[PDB]
Amino acid sequence: SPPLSIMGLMPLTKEVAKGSIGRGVLPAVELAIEQIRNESLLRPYFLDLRLYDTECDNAKGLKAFYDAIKYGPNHLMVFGGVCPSVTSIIAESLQGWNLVQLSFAATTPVLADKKKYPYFFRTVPSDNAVNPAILKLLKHYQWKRVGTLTQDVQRFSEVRNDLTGVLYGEDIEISDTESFSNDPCTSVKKLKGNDVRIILGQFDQNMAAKVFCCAYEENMYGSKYQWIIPGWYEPSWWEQSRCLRKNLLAAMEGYIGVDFEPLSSKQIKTISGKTPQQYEREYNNKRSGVGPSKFHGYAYDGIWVIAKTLQRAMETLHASIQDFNYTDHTLGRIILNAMNETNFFGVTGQVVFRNGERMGTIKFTQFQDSREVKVGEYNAVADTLEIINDTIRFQGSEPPKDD
């Protein structure tokens, strides 16, 4: 039984804040590995996943990668890369060791640059993947005029910059573009003055409560307004200076949240023979005391992407692995070509790449009285929107008008 070694790069330490992503996905990884070994899918071989803790640090993460190449076995590909600056360092250098990388948690749009990161792939949609989804939502509700509210932090300005390109050549006008660093109130007053009705917001959880505070003060809420903001905030994030809690909840009422869909809602069997609901029960039993991670499905589908890629690669070699060392450019190209062929239904839906980027599912939520409730989903492959009937609601007789 020869090994097909894979370099697992992720923060695993309890000390490191992002170690929760690494540990939270490991039960899902274990489940996929166990099944692939049982079914003898990789027969004669077996998937050998070696884990190296990157600690979410540029220097430590580089040394972890360097140490894995020096002392570790001959890895065929990289699995992981969570933290944006460490992942970019590794992802940029990949070709030097002819190593294809598959991440399940790095969402930074920067990585979509295939001139800089040609050997990098990811099962998780990037932070920009929300923009083709929002376009569909605007088209659906006939919102042709929008305003934007962005925090001057790279994570958010990347998203706002991508929005320009998505709305170009569509019947949608960005009538007002407003930025803020520490306080949104000045920008929120300008949006009110320019008579903006549909606001596309890109800011962190801390800034969101300030945004909705200014919104209440400037009456930028109710039947006339639609706030479309991030959907990845902590639940009860608003509970955690001048506005009251009841006044924040009043301004928040009806906001639409946008984020990737953690797992498929379709009760259809996946590549493993389990529906997403069955896998989720299997994951929750296996995780035990370890806290759950929203990237667990992306990590699970990730292992299947690697196993299926290795299968295709093995067939390509037979059409004409042990000797591969980072020197074999040709095998790296074979693995790279095999990964680009990925097309199967996984626990996060259909797993397909478009230039290393995941074509996935985007979840739409709406804040209703006390929490965010699912109101729809966008399918990136088909470019379609499905709005759940009798969930989404507007304070007025009709959805708001854009002017």
Binding site: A59, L62, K63, Y66, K70, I89, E92, G96, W97
Partner: protein, 409 residues
């Protein structure tokens, strides 16, 4: 009795954004020969070089950084060129307890001791233009300055430093405008806001676009003074660019009288440095080694910094003198060379070499003015000793510099 080999791990960018390695590698080869042939510097040790071509790419350099650290022999210092490559190796270096010495990095971000605890550079930070700027403002009695930059991290960082430096001198920044590629709207705003003293930071392609727009808006004349980086090609404003409407005569008009600051990279003086060479002798010696002519070969103007980097290290190692026992897992020797590097003070081919608290090189700046489509040397400024050499070569339309204010027109 037995001379022991001590190794430098270097990265030379032979291609990329700054192909500085083309003239910097031979300059390094010459400096090592010069240090090794002198029995009064490291008599007990022989300084040897192990190098790779980084191609001025962090991704590419990551491969060679591995090759330098995970292959025998043990290296005692790391020497990168490009700012992007130095950011990568200087941040990573603490994991192998290594001093990093750059011969070609100008990025202001590289003067951060939290991110880069063991970093030094013989190439000064781009922020070295800022004390000369504040000094020229103080000389001509201006307290109101407008700034225009192209959208690049290095320019943003340089303007960020200029802010805290003008505040110390009782000078304020009136207006700050930026552009990614097209400077039409930021220059139109400079006219609208009636800006007189303007600092503009951009590359050559963008400079032609700025000054074409500057002609169209009549943003030049007696009323205005432009402060640019003196790093452009010889008749940059005369260079043909089909993207600009303006003519050669029209932009020779728009650029008339502007001031430039440039980092001094070769001692203008005819003195002899520690190698006992003159600035002129170094150039002649260097020209001989090269396959191609100085104009063709990249990093020729920065080559004295690479030569001086080798001497800075040799003298630092001379001050410490147990070098064979260096290990990547031990801070002891590193902390000693850091202290010796931090205390550097010697005359090199590029001038007097000293480092600030950040590990960034302190040097003279050359101040010039464009008089009749040609740059004329109007002086030099020394940030550390606060001394300005004035040529009395400056010229102005009204016989004297204008003013920032609406007041004298």
């Amino acid at each position: 009795s037995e001379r022991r080999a001590v190794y430098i791990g270097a990265l030379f960018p032979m291609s990329g954004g700054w192909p500085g390695g083309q003239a910097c590698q031979p300059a390094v080869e010459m400096a090592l020969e010069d240090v090794n042939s002198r029995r009064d510097i490291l008599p007990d040790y022989e300084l040897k070089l192990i190098h790779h071509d980084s191609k001025c790419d962090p991704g590419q350099a990551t491969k060679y950084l591995y090759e330098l650290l995970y292959n025998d022999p043990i290296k005692i210092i790391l020497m990168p060129g490009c700012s992007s490559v130095s950011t990568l190796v200087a941040e990573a270096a603490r994991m192998w307890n290594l001093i990093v010495l750059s011969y070609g990095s100008s990025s202001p971000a590289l003067s951060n001791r939290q991110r880069f605890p063991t970093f030094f550079r013989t190439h000064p930070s781009a922020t070295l233009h800022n004390p000369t700027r504040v000094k020229l403002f103080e000389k001509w009695g201006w307290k109101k300055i407008a700034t225009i930059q192209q959208t690049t991290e290095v320019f943003t960082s340089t303007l960020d430093d200029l802010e805290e430096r003008v505040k110390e001198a009782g000078i304020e920044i009136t207006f700050r405008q930026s552009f990614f590629s097209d400077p039409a709207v930021p220059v139109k705003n400079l006219k609208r806001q009636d800006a007189r003293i303007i600092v503009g930071l951009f590359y050559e392609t963008e400079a032609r676009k700025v000054f074409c727009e500057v002609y169209k808006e009549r943003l030049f004349g007696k009323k205005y003074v432009w402060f640019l980086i003196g790093w452009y090609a010889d008749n940059w404003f005369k260079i043909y660019d089909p993207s600009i409407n303006c003519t050669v005569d029209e932009m020779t008009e728009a650029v008339e009288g502007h001031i430039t600051t440039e980092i001094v990279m070769l001692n203008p003086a005819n003195t002899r440095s520690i190698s006992n060479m003159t600035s002129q002798e170094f150039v002649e010696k260097l020209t001989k080694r090269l396959k191609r002519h100085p104009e063709e070969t990249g990093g020729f103007q920065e080559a004295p910094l690479a030569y001086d980097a080798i001497w800075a290290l040799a003298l630092a190692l001379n001050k410490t003198s147990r070098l064979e026992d260096f290990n990547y897992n031990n801070q002891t020797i590193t902390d000693q060379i850091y202290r010796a590097m931090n205390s550097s003070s010697f005359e090199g081919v590029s001038g007097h070499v000293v480092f600030d608290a950040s590990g960034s090189r302190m040097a003279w700046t050359l101040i010039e003015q464009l008089q009749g489509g040609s740059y004329k040397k109007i002086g030099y400024y020394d940030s550390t000793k606060d001394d300005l050499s004035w040529s009395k070569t400056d010229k102005w339309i009204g016989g004297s510099p204008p003013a920032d204010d609406y007041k004298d027109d």
